[PDB]
Amino acid sequence: QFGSTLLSLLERKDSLSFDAYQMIQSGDLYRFSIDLQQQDIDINKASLE
Amino acid sequence: NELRGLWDRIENRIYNLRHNLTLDGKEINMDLYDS
């Protein structure tokens, strides 16, 4: 009972640590998305000129 | 009236020559862009 308690809790521990690390994977992608797209304001201004 | 039109014309043309770089247009600085 103690060994299966330790094992089944350790699956619950190492499952949720994956769900955590999977979120921060978005942080670089937002930076690159904004710093690519923002130029279309400068192109829409250059087209008005 | 011709004297008053004439002296004001030469005053305007001196102002343009004293800036030079217009030619009453914009010769030197154009098409530049940033960001």
* Chain A residue at shortest CA distance from B32: A46
Task: Give the resolution to one decimal, in Å.
Answer: 4.4
> Using a CB-CB distance cutoff of 8 angstroms, which residues of chain B are in contact with residue A46?
33
Q: Where are the alpha helices (H) located in A1-49, listed in sequence order?
A: 2-21, 27-37, 39-48
Of A33, A20, A45, the closest CA to residue B35 belongs to A45
CA atoms within 13 A on the CB side of A39: 6
Please state, in angstroms and rounded to a whole number, the distance separating the CA atoms of residues A30 and A24. 11
Q: According to the entry, how was the structure determined?
A: cryo-EM
Length of chain A: 49
- For chain B, say whether A46 makes contact (Cβ under 8 Å): yes
- For chain A, say whether B35 makes contact (Cβ under 8 Å): yes
- Put simply, the answer to whether B33 touches A46 (Cβ < 8 Å) is yes
